Amino acid sequence: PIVDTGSVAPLSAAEKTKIRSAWAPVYSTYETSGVDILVKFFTSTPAAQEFFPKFKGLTTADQLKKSADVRWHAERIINAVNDAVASMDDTEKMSMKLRDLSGKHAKSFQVDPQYFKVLAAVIADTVAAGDAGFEKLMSMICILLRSAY
Amino acid sequence: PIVDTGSVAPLSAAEKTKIRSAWAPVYSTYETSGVDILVKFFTSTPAAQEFFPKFKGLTTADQLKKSADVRWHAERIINAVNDAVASMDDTEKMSMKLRDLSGKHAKSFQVDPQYFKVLAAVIADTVAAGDAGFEKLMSMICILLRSAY
Ligand code: HEM
Ligand code: HEM
């Protein structure tokens, strides 16, 4: 499963290749992909809904998909992941980016760090439900997004 | 016209209101708006094309609108402006954001500062062709994006 603590073994050349493949199609239409994922996560995880101030008032999955605020937010998340995917070969760069992102969440957005793996789960279940290699990537991302807390 | 040097008078309550109105519709579909603007700017201003490394190979306005890299890039620009519009009342905040953005362009992206006003012109011509109040906002944005150079 997806972890957000400790450490995970390096990604193997085989795993990286599987990821790039499973990913490519999803990013080709991140506009949509992104929105669905975020809408799915949000509608099914009420406890974290209070952390998206700009979505106050939006309850149905219908309204959300029509809000430009939901789309922007969803588009940024989906690309942060895309950035990671693109840095799988430069673990150095991937860290700097996410560690910076971790800081923003902890100091400015003040979001509960427990949902990182919950949303990561939806992204994984959507992009490549079942792949363990992709679960590693999401675990690294989660572990790093919590580094600032 | 749009300036990127010196200073400009403060926005009047009247101008701000005109701006918010002319903007709202555009942002409601920034996904599209953004792409068109960026595609227009890029296709008609060759001299600045070499500054978008990720667009190498893309020449027709057809290819561009299909590239996820163009879309992401266009979506970020369009929102930076949206951020400004939202800060028209807090000139303080608007500065910090843009001054930071100025730095990234000068130190990391290494873009020629002369195109800020050229692209700003297309955004203005598209969102509210003719409005002088909107030209002020774009001027403030341009003056600030050059502060780091
Ligand atoms: C799946 C892992 C996640 C990634 C990679 C991620 C990525 C992002 C990105 C790319 C941004 C833009 C940062 C910026 O504005 O400069 C961001 C902003 C934000 N994130 Fe996360 N995020 C993740 C999970 C979460 C979770 C679980 C929450 C909390 C429920 C959350 C709440 C927010 C909020 C409140 C903002 C800013 C809202 C705004 O001003 O639009 N994020 N995130
Ligand atoms: C209309 C004024 C402009 C605004 C408000 C603006 C805003 C932005 C924003 C928000 C980003 C991303 C910042 C980040 O994530 O680090 C960006 C990136 C960038 N901008 Fe600008 N920009 C403007 C004009 C320009 C111009 C005219 C050039 C070209 C000469 C330029 C070239 C770049 C480059 C090279 C990037 C890298 C993005 C990438 O390909 O990944 N920008 N800009």
UniProtKB/Swiss-Prot annotation, chains A, B:
The UniProt record lists the keyword Nucleotide-binding: no
Keyword terms: Heme, Iron, Metal-binding, Oxygen transport, Transport
Binding site for heme b: H73, H105
Record GO terms (molecular function): heme binding; iron ion binding; oxidoreductase activity; oxygen binding; oxygen carrier activity
InterPro entries assigned to the protein according to its UniProt record, in alphabetical order: Globin, Globin-like_sf, Globin/Proto, Globin_lamprey/hagfish
PROSITE patterns: GLOBIN (PS01033)
Domain Globin: 10-149
PANTHER family given in the database record: CYTOGLOBIN, CYTOGLOBIN-1-RELATED
Note in the entry: Globin V is the major component of the 6 globins found in the Sea lamprey.
Family: Belongs to the globin family.
Quaternary data: Monomer at high oxygen tension and high pH and dimeric at low oxygen tension and lower pH.
Name used for this protein in its record: Globin-5
Annotated source species: Petromyzon marinus
Species classification: Eukaryota, Metazoa, Chordata, Craniata, Vertebrata
